């Protein structure tokens, strides 16, 4: 069949997140807040190309984005962060109820330097809208002419033609 | 026999069958397959006698392994198909396994050796049951199957149990055994034609099972169960002489009774598909089948089979038995020739 | 592969032991026992009680195993149907043990 | 590590019903106004290393085995099924944490009737055969009820998971909103285990009688394991201790502290009630469990709907 | 496919050169039945969890249950024949045959 | 109808009592008005992504952001 | 024969199992969702003999989706080439396919 | 040879198929195909499929096969060559598979079969905060209707057919 | 006491729902790349 | 068993003597053993000597017939020069019939075994001349 098309590591080549589980989790909700769009279009757009070589450089957006994130955490309120990752860390199952005072403290300290308001129960569930510039894919499944329907039935039911004509019969 | 318990167990029957008629996924299919033999255990094992539990256990044991076969197809054609509509199948040892696992069932020969017993050793309503209503499921799964069905295996299937049945029905003596082997010769003949118009597969179906209802209820009312007996209700009433005479006439393709109306169009659509040695070939094993017929009816009333003497006693007494069905059933197994075209109903 | 680990150290610790009660005795030189029970001579007869609630058991453990699922299945969206459908197979399960009940199968094995 | 790990919980299993045995020599005679084992050591220390020592260097009783093989097989399924069964308990981490652990101990203890019919199997002695058949009866009987009763329990719980069933008793105990499942769970433990006053494998013949000594003291060494695992079990799920997450040792100490006065509560009921029939106790739950069991099914499956108190999967 | 797919069809048809070419009594084919029992149980199970159809983990559960209750049927006609000739051999199944 | 009652209590209490049990897990889901709070608790549960549409122009039931108040809030289970 | 009950009075009983396409809890995508997605919309209303005679290269896509027969072989060859080219020694496998490279994130 | 453990575990399968496809005696066969069900639930649990695996040991093993034993116990009673030369047959069969499998890869019987290991087939894909199966079985009380009323129609029939065809009378 | 407990549990299974669903577009990215990475480099080593 | 009848027939008539011999003696061979398997399946043998004498016995005769048969139609087309005549394989089937009276120690059986095999033979013959079709794909 036809030759698969791939994009070369010089398309792949980026800086990455170098950080870890509790990490990530930590901040998961500014996250959500704060770099909120450009994570809607590259969402969008993979899910209606359907294909990972036509959202690629949407993807990188969102690493500069979210790196953009990480700096403002690291300039400002370094220190609480740490205090929040390491108790979240400490935990096996990673559960957020028993780091209730860090949370608090860590919201505190964010909102006053910087004003980051952390979201409600819901507001992260929600759907949302995204103003993107790409076109619209006319054919997403890469498909073909489907075929021709048969004909469907047509005209009034005429009466039987010389009865049912099993070898005598006439009616 | 609790009258509650047998109406819950024939319900428990209907909707097994119903069941397997009116889904569209192959697990209800199985799953009234196993209602349906689980519920009609208990009917074959209503007089409680050994041969009865003889009879149910070989019935027990076939229809599970024809089963096993059954989910052996579905696999198959699962992992083939990766989709559960009851239709043609995808793969030929789906269809070639699915095709001898309802010959299993249906007691198509050589799978046929289950049949001539099991009916030989339970009461005549569970013969009645097993020989008229088992065989109306099958014959739905077969309808549903027919593109996938290869030619070459239900071909000699069917010539194998028309040939066998046949020559079995030939030698037995027993009623039982007669019947079970002239349903073997008929399940053969209307397998033959199913390739080619399924709605002749329908209307010999119809027929004969209202050709063996109608010789089993006579059976039931008579109280006979050997050649002896059935020679000997000719004091009792010699009307029902008349009428299994007239239906044992019918019984044999001999027209212009309602038992020369499937056959011949049998035949009306093998020489379509440009066949003319096949029905030919079923047609002199149709002569066979009506030769132990002849056989039973110059047993039956034909002749004068010399009585015993308590016959006179049974003289004073009418026949008390719900005798349910009898006339219609009668009546549509010996006049129905003139409206053959009503089979376009069954389209 | 850590829970078959353990598994195998677990098996052949019972190996190590029932080989030390097998063998190890047989160092000693005691004795040889010749040895020249209520049951004389008749065979074994067939309760038919036990068979009974054996199978019983069998069907009530096959119709629990389709009564399982409840505890994953309580996050469905569709409740009411789940409502219903659970009250409807213990009434079934009610129903079997009253037919059990009545038709003299917890008689001379209560 | 993980052998480590492994060891040390498979030699103090040994140890424990070693103790076992011990304790409850003791405790049935401090019960009955005598006195138990303390001439050997100080205060009986040093009785149950005896014990293993003089089972561990008798002779066999030299059954004419029917079949060797599984005579053999026996006691190494009965040891297998009691030892390696002690693993998702989570005390207060288990040693291998699955999601169906439940489900995984409920299904060994249901195939472990397998010993005793191998047992049975093994005596050529008829009598033996009748009395493993009627203790296999009443086995997977009381193994249909224990089912249902912890279907209910984590249906009110709503994860299979055992270790998230710590979190679930952290405000209130489950024995307070759960206390006739309670009973029955009770009533249910004290039976399962082959245990008087329904203990029909000593009064009349045990269904190991053509048994050696070593598998003898193999089977009693495996019913005592399954006597602290499921008291262990009712300590954890019915009982469950207040757990911190940086300080776990208040939490084992408080469970052990439950398992050791439930399995005083244990050798209580079995000095002070006498023995059942076997029709008795067979009454006992197909005509006054069964249906109170599957009416507290239906009670605690239509409640969390209608309280809006369904647990989380998760 | 996967090799572990032929070697359950392989077992499957062990189990049917098992259970038609038997010497001993009812027991065996009924342990034959339950090896096909197992066999078409495993098939499933494995077919369903490979090709990630959520809704079809209702196949093999149902696929034991109903035969199941199928198998303690056949359980209960070999006790009949225990309470009827004593022993459960197919060689005393000879008395329908005349 | 009310010694018959009292007559199935002291003759089978385990009987009466399991009835009684159904009947009432039988009439009180449906009486009990909270049924319809466990199904809005278990509909609202986010077990899959939210994933965004594409805004045509004309849509004014669907917010820009998750912070945004237009949409389905979930502020009922937080204050019960 | 087929009597369609459901089709009758309107009423689903085993609809939703029987196409692997089909809608499932929490929306779950099996392997093959797409391939046989396009197999039916190219087989529907049609007719199974014109399905099988016009759409064969749909159902053919769907079966290798389904089975990996010719992935297989591929792998297979691969896999042999490898083994023989270290064989007689004229190629060596780079780092990063022997879990020394520093993997990505 | 750790990688190919699933098909190891079926080769082993198939042995607990040879262990009672002679049929000896019906107790031995029952041990061998216990031992059978144990393995073939191990080649379930390592696809990922942890509920139906313990379906297999709670149901299959735990609670039907003792039933099996619990019949075969009541007959049989306590106390072959062409026994033997079947187990020898099927050795012989099955490892001449086992060599073809192992040396060509490849294989004919019915169809095309390959050789190769199976951790090809696997998926990297993730589920999210939830066991695909798990909700698979939990999905019957809320989609299942009709199979769950045949179910238990089909059960509580069978509960009937106990009462009435072994009552005897 | 259990359904105040249950409805503070459901709570915080919202809220972890909440970080995962916040948290999963740059794990879709990632193995976005590493996937591409992966078949690349198949790619490649199969030509060569 | 199928590509052995197109094996006998890629064969034409009356042409080489020795492939169609070995044909049609494979063709018997295989006959023979069915007949046999299902003999010693239903009838259950004595012992296991007496059951491979009544194998060997059945697929030995069986066998004979093939060759004789085929012989005998190929060296009858020969001395006609005619390929297309079904009298070849009447004599063919003649000389099966009288082989398998000999083999049952009968001569009226022979006799009979020569009219319906013959007759079998031309009717063998007519369906690959004039394209007979028993079993008939479906066409309308």
Same mark, same amino acid.
């Given at each position: 069949?036809?030759?698969?098309?791939?994009?070369?590591?010089?398309?792949?080549?980026?800086?990455?997140?170098?950080?870890?589980?509790?990490?990530?989790?930590?901040?998961?909700?500014?996250?959500?807040?704060?770099?909120?769009?450009?994570?809607?279009?590259?969402?969008?757009?993979?899910?209606?190309?359907?294909?990972?070589?036509?959202?690629?450089?949407?993807?990188?957006?969102?690493?500069?984005?979210?790196?953009?994130?990480?700096?403002?955490?690291?300039?400002?309120?370094?220190?609480?962060?740490?205090?929040?990752?390491?108790?979240?860390?400490?935990?096996?199952?990673?559960?957020?109820?028993?780091?209730?005072?860090?949370?608090?403290?860590?919201?505190?300290?964010?909102?006053?330097?910087?004003?980051?308001?952390?979201?409600?129960?819901?507001?992260?569930?929600?759907?949302?809208?995204?103003?993107?510039?790409?076109?619209?894919?006319?054919?997403?499944?890469?498909?073909?002419?489907?075929?021709?329907?048969?004909?469907?039935?047509?005209?009034?039911?005429?009466?039987?033609?010389?009865?049912?004509?099993?070898?005598?019969?006439?009616? | 026999?609790?009258?509650?318990?047998?109406?819950?167990?024939?319900?428990?029957?209907?909707?097994?069958?119903?069941?397997?008629?009116?889904?569209?996924?192959?697990?209800?299919?199985?799953?009234?397959?196993?209602?349906?033999?689980?519920?009609?255990?208990?009917?074959?094992?209503?007089?409680?006698?050994?041969?009865?539990?003889?009879?149910?256990?070989?019935?027990?044991?076939?229809?599970?392994?024809?089963?096993?076969?059954?989910?052996?197809?579905?696999?198959?054609?699962?992992?083939?198909?990766?989709?559960?509509?009851?239709?043609?199948?995808?793969?030929?040892?789906? *269809?070639?396994?699915?095709?001898?696992?309802?010959?299993?069932?249906?007691?198509?020969?050589?799978?046929?050796?289950?049949?001539?017993?099991?009916?030989?050793?339970?009461?005549?309503?569970?013969?009645?049951?097993?020989?008229?209503?088992?065989?109306?499921?099958?014959?739905?799964?077969?309808?549903?199957?027919?593109?996938?069905?290869?030619?070459?295996?239900?071909?000699?299937?069917?010539?194998?149990?028309?040939?066998?049945?046949?020559?079995?029905?030939?030698?037995?003596?027993?009623?039982?055994?007669?019947?079970?082997?002239? *349903?073997?010769?008929?399940?053969?003949?209307?397998?033959?034609?199913?390739?080619?118009?399924?709605?002749?597969?329908?209307?010999?179906?119809?027929?004969?099972?209202?050709?063996?209802?109608?010789?089993?209820?006579?059976?039931?009312?008579?109280?006979?169960?050997?050649?002896?007996?059935?020679?000997?209700?000719?004091?009792?009433?010699?009307?029902?002489?008349?009428?299994?005479?007239?239906?044992?006439? *019918?019984?044999?393709?001999?027209?212009?009774?309602?038992?020369?109306?499937?056959?011949?169009?049998?035949?009306?659509?093998?020489?379509?598909?440009?066949?003319?040695?096949?029905?030919?070939?079923?047609?002199?094993?149709?002569?066979?089948?009506?030769?132990?017929?002849?056989?039973?009816?110059?047993?039956?009333?034909?002749?004068?089979?010399?009585?015993?003497?308590?016959?006179?006693?049974?003289?004073?007494?009418?026949?008390?038995?719900?005798?349910?069905?009898?006339?219609?059933?009668?009546?549509?197994?010996?006049?129905?020739?003139?409206?053959?075209?009503?089979?376009?109903?069954?389209? | 592969?850590?829970?078959?680990?353990?598994?195998?150290?677990?098996?052949?610790?019972?190996?190590?032991?029932?080989?030390?009660?097998?063998?190890?005795?047989?160092?000693?030189?005691?004795?040889? %026992?010749?040895?020249?029970?209520?049951?004389?001579?008749?065979?074994?007869?067939?309760?038919?009680?036990?068979?009974?609630?054996?199978?019983?058991?069998?069907?009530?453990?096959?119709?629990?195993?389709?009564?399982?699922?409840?505890?994953?299945?309580?996050?469905?969206?569709?409740?009411?149907?789940?409502?219903?459908?659970?009250?409807?197979?213990?009434?079934?399960?009610?129903?079997?043990?009253?037919?059990?009940?009545?038709? %003299?199968?917890?008689?001379?094995?209560? | 590590?993980?052998?480590?790990?492994?060891?040390?919980?498979?030699?103090?299993?040994?140890?424990?019903?070693?103790?076992?045995?011990?304790?409850?020599?003791?405790?049935?005679?401090?019960?009955?106004?005598?006195?138990?084992?303390?001439?050997?050591?100080?205060?009986?220390?040093?009785?149950?290393?005896?014990?293993?020592?003089?089972?561990?260097?008798?002779?066999?009783?030299?059954?004419?085995?029917?079949?060797?093989?599984?005579?053999?097989?026996?006691?190494?399924?009965?040891?297998?099924?009691?030892?390696?069964?002690?693993?998702?308990?989570?005390?207060?981490?288990?040693?291998?944490?699955?999601?169906?652990?439940?489900?995984?101990?409920?299904?060994?203890?249901?195939?472990?009737?397998?010993?005793?019919?191998?047992?049975?199997?093994?005596?050529?002695?008829?009598?033996?055969?009748?009395?493993?058949?009627?203790?296999?009866?009443?086995?997977?009987?009381?193994?249909?009820?224990?089912?249902?009763?912890?279907?209910?329990?984590?249906?009110?719980?709503?994860?299979?998971?055992?270790?998230?069933?710590?979190?679930?008793?952290?405000?209130?105990?489950?024995?307070?909103?759960?206390?006739?499942?309670?009973?029955?769970?009770?009533?249910?433990?004290?039976?399962?285990?082959?245990?008087?006053?329904?203990?029909?494998?000593?009064?009349?013949?045990?269904?190991?009688?053509?048994?050696?000594?070593?598998?003898?003291?193999?089977?009693?060494?495996?019913?005592?394991?399954?006597?602290?695992?499921?008291?262990?079990?009712?300590?954890?799920?019915?009982?469950?201790?207040?757990?911190?997450?940086?300080?776990?040792?208040?939490?084992?100490?408080?469970?052990?502290?439950?398992?050791?006065?439930?399995?005083?509560?244990?050798?209580?009921?079995?000095?002070?009630?006498?023995?059942?029939?076997?029709?008795?106790?067979?009454?006992?739950?197909?005509?006054?469990?069964?249906?109170?069991?599957?009416?507290?099914?239906?009670?605690?499956?239509?409640?969390?709907?209608?309280?809006?108190?369904?647990?989380?999967?998760? | 496919?996967?090799?572990?797919?032929?070697?359950?069809?392989?077992?499957?048809?062990?189990?049917?050169?098992?259970?038609?070419?038997?010497?001993?009594?009812?027991?065996?084919?009924?342990?034959?039945?339950?090896?096909?029992?197992?066999?078409?149980?495993?098939?499933?199970?494995?077919?369903?969890?490979?090709?990630?159809?959520?809704?079809?983990?209702?196949?093999?559960?149902?696929?034991?249950?109903?035969?199941?209750?199928?198998?303690?049927?056949?359980?209960?006609?070999?006790?009949?024949?225990?309470?009827?000739?004593?022993?459960?051999?197919?060689?005393?199944?000879?008395?329908?045959?005349? | 109808?009310?010694?018959?009652?009292?007559?199935?209590?002291?003759?089978?209490?385990?009987?009466?009592?399991?009835?009684?049990?159904?009947?009432?897990?039988?009439?009180?889901?449906?009486?009990?008005?909270?049924?319809?709070?466990?199904?809005?608790?278990?509909?609202?549960?986010?077990?899959?992504?939210?994933?965004?549409?594409?805004?045509?122009?004309?849509?004014?039931?669907?917010?820009?952001?998750?912070?945004?108040?237009?949409?389905?809030?979930?502020?009922?289970?937080?204050?019960? | 024969?087929?009597?369609?009950?459901?089709?009758?009075?309107?009423?689903?009983?085993?609809?939703?199992?029987?196409?692997?396409?089909?809608?499932?809890?929490?929306?779950?995508?099996?392997?093959?969702?797409?391939?046989?997605?396009?197999?039916?919309?190219?087989?529907?209303?049609?007719?199974?003999?014109?399905?099988?005679?016009?759409?064969?290269?749909?159902?053919?896509?769907?079966?290798?989706?389904?089975?990996?027969?010719?992935?297989?072989?591929?792998?297979?060859?691969?896999?042999?080439?490898?083994?023989?080219?270290?064989?007689?020694?004229?190629?060596?496998?780079?780092?990063?396919?022997?879990?020394?490279?520093?993997?990505?994130? | 040879?750790?990688?190919?453990?699933?098909?190891?575990?079926?080769?082993?399968?198939?042995?607990?198929?040879?262990?009672?496809?002679?049929?000896?005696?019906?107790?031995?066969?029952?041990?061998?195909?216990?031992?059978?069900?144990?393995?073939?639930?191990?080649?379930?649990?390592?696809?990922?499929?942890?509920?139906?695996?313990?379906?297999?040991?709670?149901?299959?093993?735990?609670?039907?096969?003792?039933?099996?034993?619990?019949?075969?116990?009541?007959?049989?009673?306590?106390?072959?060559?062409?026994?033997?030369?079947?187990?020898?047959?099927?050795?012989?069969?099955?490892?001449?598979?086992?060599?073809?499998?192992?040396?060509?890869?490849?294989?004919?019987?019915?169809?095309?079969?390959?050789?190769?290991?199976?951790?090809?087939?696997?998926?990297?894909?993730?589920?999210?905060?939830?066991?695909?199966?798990?909700?698979?079985?939990?999905?019957?009380?809320?989609?299942?209707?009709?199979?769950?009323?045949?179910?238990?129609?089909?059960?509580?029939?069978?509960?009937?057919?106990?009462?009435?065809?072994?009552?005897?009378? | 006491?259990?359904?105040?407990?249950?409805?503070?549990?459901?709570?915080?299974?919202?809220?972890?729902?909440?970080?995962?669903?916040?948290?999963?577009?740059?794990?879709?990215?990632?193995?976005?790349?590493?996937?591409?990475?992966?078949?690349?480099?198949?790619?490649?080593?199969?030509?060569? | 068993?199928?590509?052995?009848?197109?094996?006998?027939?890629?064969?034409?008539?009356?042409?080489?003597?020795?492939?169609?011999?070995?044909?049609?003696?494979?063709?018997?061979?295989?006959?023979?053993?069915?007949?046999?398997?299902?003999?010693?399946?239903?009838?259950?043998?004595?012992?296991?000597?007496?059951?491979?004498?009544?194998?060997?016995?059945?697929?030995?005769?069986?066998?004979?017939?093939?060759?004789?048969?085929?012989?005998?139609?190929?060296?009858?087309?020969?001395?006609?020069?005619?390929?297309?005549?079904?009298?070849?394989?009447?004599?063919?089937?003649?000389?099966?019939?009288?082989?398998?009276?000999?083999?049952?120690?009968?001569?009226?059986?022979?006799?009979?075994?020569?009219?319906?095999?013959?007759?079998?033979?031309?009717?063998?013959?007519?369906?690959?001349?004039?394209?007979?079709?028993?079993?008939?794909?479906?066409?309308?």
């Amino acid at each position: 069949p036809g030759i698969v098309e791939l994009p070369s590591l010089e398309d792949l080549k980026v800086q990455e997140v170098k950080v870890s589980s509790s990490v990530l989790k930590a901040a998961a909700h500014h996250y959500g807040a704060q770099c909120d769009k450009p994570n809607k279009e590259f969402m969008l757009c993979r899910w209606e190309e359907k294909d990972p070589r036509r959202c690629l450089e949407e993807g990188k957006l969102v690493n500069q984005c979210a790196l953009e994130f990480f700096r403002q955490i690291k300039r400002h309120c370094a220190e609480p962060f740490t205090e929040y990752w390491t108790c979240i860390d400490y935990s096996g199952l990673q559960l957020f109820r028993r780091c209730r005072k860090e949370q608090a403290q860590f919201d505190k300290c964010v909102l006053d330097k910087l004003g980051w308001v952390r979201p409600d129960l819901g507001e992260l569930s929600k759907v949302t809208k995204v103003k993107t510039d790409r076109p619209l894919p006319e054919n997403p499944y890469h498909s073909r002419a489907r075929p021709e329907p048969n004909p469907e039935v047509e005209g009034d039911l005429k009466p039987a033609r010389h009865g049912s004509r099993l070898f005598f019969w006439t009616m | 026999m609790n009258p509650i318990i047998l109406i819950i167990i024939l319900m428990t029957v209907m909707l097994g069958t119903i069941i397997v008629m009116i889904s569209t996924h192959w697990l209800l299919i199985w799953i009234g397959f196993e209602m349906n033999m689980l519920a009609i255990i208990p009917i074959m094992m209503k007089k409680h006698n050994p041969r009865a539990t003889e009879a149910s256990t070989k019935y027990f044991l076939t229809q599970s392994t024809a089963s096993m076969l059954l989910m052996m197809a579905i696999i198959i054609n699962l992992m083939f198909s990766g989709q559960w509509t009851v239709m043609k199948l995808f793969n030929p040892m789906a *269809s070639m396994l699915m095709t001898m696992a309802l010959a299993m069932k249906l007691g198509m020969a050589p799978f046929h050796f289950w049949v001539p017993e099991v009916t030989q050793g339970i009461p005549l309503s569970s013969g009645l049951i097993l020989l008229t209503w088992q065989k109306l499921a099958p014959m739905s799964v077969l309808y549903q199957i027919l593109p996938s069905i290869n030619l070459d295996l239900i071909l000699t299937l069917s010539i194998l149990s028309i040939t066998i049945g046949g020559w079995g029905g030939l030698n037995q003596t027993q009623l039982r055994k007669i019947m079970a082997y002239s *349903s073997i010769a008929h399940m053969g003949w209307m397998t033959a034609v199913l390739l080619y118009n399924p709605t002749m597969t329908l209307l010999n179906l119809i027929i004969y099972i209202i050709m063996t209802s109608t010789m089993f209820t006579l059976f039931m009312a008579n109280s006979t169960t050997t050649t002896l007996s059935l020679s000997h209700t000719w004091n009792k009433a010699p009307i029902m002489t008349i009428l299994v005479l007239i239906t044992l006439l *019918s019984m044999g393709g001999l027209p212009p009774l309602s038992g020369f109306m499937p056959k011949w169009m049998i035949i009306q659509e093998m020489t379509k598909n440009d066949s003319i040695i096949l029905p030919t070939l079923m047609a002199i094993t149709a002569l066979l089948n009506l030769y132990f017929y002849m056989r039973l009816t110059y047993s039956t009333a034909l002749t004068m089979f010399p009585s015993t003497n308590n016959m006179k006693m049974k003289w004073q007494f009418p026949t008390t038995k719900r005798m349910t069905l009898l006339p219609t059933m009668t009546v549509l197994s010996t006049m129905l020739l003139p409206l053959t075209p009503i089979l376009s109903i069954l389209e | 592969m850590n829970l078959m680990i353990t598994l195998l150290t677990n098996f052949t610790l019972a190996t190590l032991l029932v080989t030390i009660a097998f063998w190890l005795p047989q160092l000693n030189v005691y004795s040889e %026992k010749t040895s020249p029970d209520p049951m004389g001579s008749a065979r074994l007869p067939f309760s038919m009680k036990f068979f009974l609630v054996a199978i019983t058991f069998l069907l009530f453990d096959l119709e629990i195993a389709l009564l399982l699922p409840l505890p994953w299945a309580s996050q469905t969206t569709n409740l009411n149907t789940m409502l219903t459908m659970a009250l409807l197979l213990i009434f079934l399960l009610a129903v079997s043990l009253a037919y059990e009940w009545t038709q %003299k199968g917890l008689e001379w094995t209560e | 590590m993980f052998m480590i790990n492994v060891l040390t919980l498979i030699i103090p299993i040994l140890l424990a019903v070693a103790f076992l045995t011990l304790v409850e020599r003791k405790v049935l005679g401090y019960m009955q106004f005598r006195k138990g084992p303390n001439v050997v050591g100080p205060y009986g220390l040093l009785q149950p290393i005896a014990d293993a020592i003089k089972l561990f260097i008798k002779e066999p009783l030299r059954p004419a085995t029917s079949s060797i093989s599984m005579f053999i097989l026996a006691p190494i399924l009965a040891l297998t099924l009691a030892l390696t069964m002690w693993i998702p308990l989570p005390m207060p981490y288990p040693l291998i944490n699955m999601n169906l652990g439940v489900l995984f101990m409920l299904a060994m203890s249901s195939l472990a009737v397998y010993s005793i019919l191998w047992s049975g199997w093994a005596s050529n002695s008829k009598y033996a055969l009748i009395g493993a058949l009627r203790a296999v009866a009443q086995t997977i009987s009381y193994e249909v009820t224990l089912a249902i009763i912890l279907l209910s329990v984590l249906l009110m719980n709503g994860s299979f998971t055992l270790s998230t069933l710590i979190i679930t008793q952290e405000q209130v105990w489950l024995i307070f909103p759960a206390w006739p499942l309670a009973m029955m769970w009770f009533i249910s433990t004290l039976a399962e285990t082959n245990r008087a006053p329904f203990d029909l494998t000593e009064g009349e013949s045990g269904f190991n009688v053509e048994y050696a000594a070593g598998p003898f003291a193999l089977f009693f060494m495996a019913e005592y394991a399954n006597i602290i695992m499921m008291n262990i079990f009712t300590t954890t799920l019915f009982l469950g201790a207040f757990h911190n997450p940086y300080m776990p040792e208040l939490y084992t100490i408080n469970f052990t502290i439950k398992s050791l006065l439930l399995s005083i509560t244990f050798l209580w009921i079995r000095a002070s009630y006498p023995r059942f029939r076997y029709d008795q106790l067979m009454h006992l739950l197909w005509k006054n469990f069964l249906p109170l069991t599957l009416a507290l099914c239906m009670w605690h499956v239509s409640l969390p709907i209608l309280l809006s108190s369904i647990p989380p999967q998760t | 496919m996967s090799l572990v797919y032929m070697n359950i069809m392989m077992a499957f048809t062990v189990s049917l050169t098992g259970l038609l070419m038997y010497r001993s009594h009812l027991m065996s084919s009924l342990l034959c039945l339950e090896g096909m029992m197992l066999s078409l149980f495993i098939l499933a199970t494995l077919m369903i969890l490979n090709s990630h159809f959520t809704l079809a983990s209702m196949m093999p559960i149902i696929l034991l249950v109903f035969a199941a209750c199928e198998a303690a049927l056949g359980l209960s006609l070999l006790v009949m024949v225990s309470n009827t000739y004593g022993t459960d051999y197919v060689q005393n199944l000879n008395l329908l045959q005349c | 109808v009310a010694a018959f009652l009292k007559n199935v209590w002291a003759k089978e209490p385990v009987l009466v009592a399991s009835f009684a049990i159904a009947g009432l897990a039988v009439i009180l889901p449906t009486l009990s008005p909270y049924t319809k709070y466990s199904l809005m608790i278990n509909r609202a549960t986010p077990y899959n992504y939210p994933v965004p549409l594409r805004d045509d122009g004309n849509m004014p039931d669907v917010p820009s952001h998750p912070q945004d108040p237009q949409g389905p809030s979930l502020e009922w289970l937080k204050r019960l | 024969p087929f009597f369609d009950v459901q089709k009758k009075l309107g009423v689903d009983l085993d609809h939703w199992m029987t196409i692997q396409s089909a809608e499932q809890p929490h929306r779950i995508p099996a392997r093959c969702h797409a391939f046989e997605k396009e197999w039916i919309e190219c087989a529907h209303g049609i007719g199974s003999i014109r399905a099988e005679k016009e759409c064969k290269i749909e159902f053919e896509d769907f079966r290798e989706c389904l089975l990996r027969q010719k992935t297989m072989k591929r792998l297979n060859a691969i896999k042999r080439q490898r083994d023989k080219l270290i064989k007689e020694g004229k190629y060596t496998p780079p780092p990063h396919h022997s879990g020394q490279e520093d993997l990505r994130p | 040879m750790m990688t190919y453990i699933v098909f190891i575990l079926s080769i082993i399968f198939v042995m607990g198929f040879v262990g009672f496809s002679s049929k000896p005696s019906p107790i031995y066969g029952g041990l061998g195909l216990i031992v059978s069900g144990g393995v073939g639930c191990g080649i379930v649990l390592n696809f990922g499929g942890s509920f139906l695996g313990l379906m297999v040991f709670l149901i299959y093993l735990g609670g039907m096969m003792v039933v099996f034993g619990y019949t075969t116990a009541m007959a049989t009673e306590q106390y072959n060559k062409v026994v033997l030369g079947t187990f020898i047959t099927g050795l012989l069969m099955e490892f001449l598979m086992v060599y073809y499998v192992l040396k060509d890869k490849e294989v004919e019987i019915v169809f095309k079969f390959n050789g190769m290991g199976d951790w090809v087939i696997y998926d990297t894909g993730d589920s999210g905060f939830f066991s695909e199966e798990a909700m698979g079985i939990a999905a019957l009380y809320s989609y299942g209707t009709w199979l769950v009323i045949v179910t238990g129609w089909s059960l509580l029939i069978g509960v009937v057919v106990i009462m009435e065809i072994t009552r005897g009378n | 006491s259990m359904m105040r407990w249950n409805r503070e549990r459901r709570r915080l299974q919202i809220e972890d729902f909440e970080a995962r669903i916040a948290l999963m577009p740059l794990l879709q990215a990632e193995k976005d790349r590493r996937v591409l990475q992966m078949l690349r480099e198949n790619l490649e080593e199969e030509a060569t | 068993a199928k590509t052995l009848l197109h094996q006998y027939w890629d064969i034409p008539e009356g042409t080489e003597c020795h492939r169609k011999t070995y044909a049609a003696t494979s063709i018997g061979g295989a006959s023979g053993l069915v007949v046999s398997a299902y003999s010693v399946a239903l009838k259950t043998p004595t012992s296991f000597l007496e059951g491979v004498a009544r194998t060997g016995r059945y697929t030995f005769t069986a066998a004979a017939i093939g060759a004789i048969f085929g012989l005998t139609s190929c060296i009858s087309a020969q001395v006609r020069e005619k390929p297309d005549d079904p009298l070849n394989y009447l004599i063919g089937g003649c000389a099966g019939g009288l082989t398998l009276g000999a083999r049952t120690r009968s001569y009226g059986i022979g006799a009979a075994a020569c009219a319906y095999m013959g007759l079998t033979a031309a009717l063998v013959k007519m369906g690959q001349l004039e394209g007979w079709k028993v079993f008939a794909e479906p066409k309308v």
